[PDB]
Amino acid sequence: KVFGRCELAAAMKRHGLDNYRGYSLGNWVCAAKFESNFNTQATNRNTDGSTDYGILQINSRWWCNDGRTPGSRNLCNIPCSALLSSDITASVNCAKKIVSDGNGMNAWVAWRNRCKGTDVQAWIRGCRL
């Protein structure tokens, strides 16, 4: 599924991401936009052999099992394919674990390079929330 901007904002808000660990909703929408272009089926292979999955490009090295990242962990205790569903519940729950782990949203390279320090509220402007 390819979400609309406000549709995704509303889905993320319902799942408790607005101000989760101090990150306003605009941060999450911005990160999704630049990680996956709002596409739940996005995948990207990294040079170390791991793969990023889903709307928030969650990595198989630590967070999910895809059966082909040897020596990796599965800290969200899910198959990586569950992160490609049109229902974002699994991605959101896993992202909550990630952003709680310590480095906050700096775990998302696209957020750090393209959302951090910008007017992220612009990503939820106009939406009925």
Residues catalogued as catalytic: 35, 52
Task: Kindly write down the DSSP assignment for every residue of 24-42, as one continuous string.
Answer: -HHHHHHHHHHHHTTBTT-
User: Please, what sign has the CA dihedral across residues 82, 83, 86, 91?
Assistant: positive
Stretch that binds Cl ion, among 5-13, 20-28, 49-57, 81-89 (CB under 5 A): 20-28
Rule CB under 5 A: say whether 40 interacts with Cl ion. Answer: no
Select from 69, 76, 92, 107 the one that contacts Na ion (CB under 5 A).
69
- 52 DSSP β-pair partners: 44, 59
- Number of residues forming the site for Cl ion (CB under 5 A): 6
The binding site for substrate consists of 101
Q: Which residues bind Cl ion (CB under 5 A)?
A: 24-26, 69, 104, 121
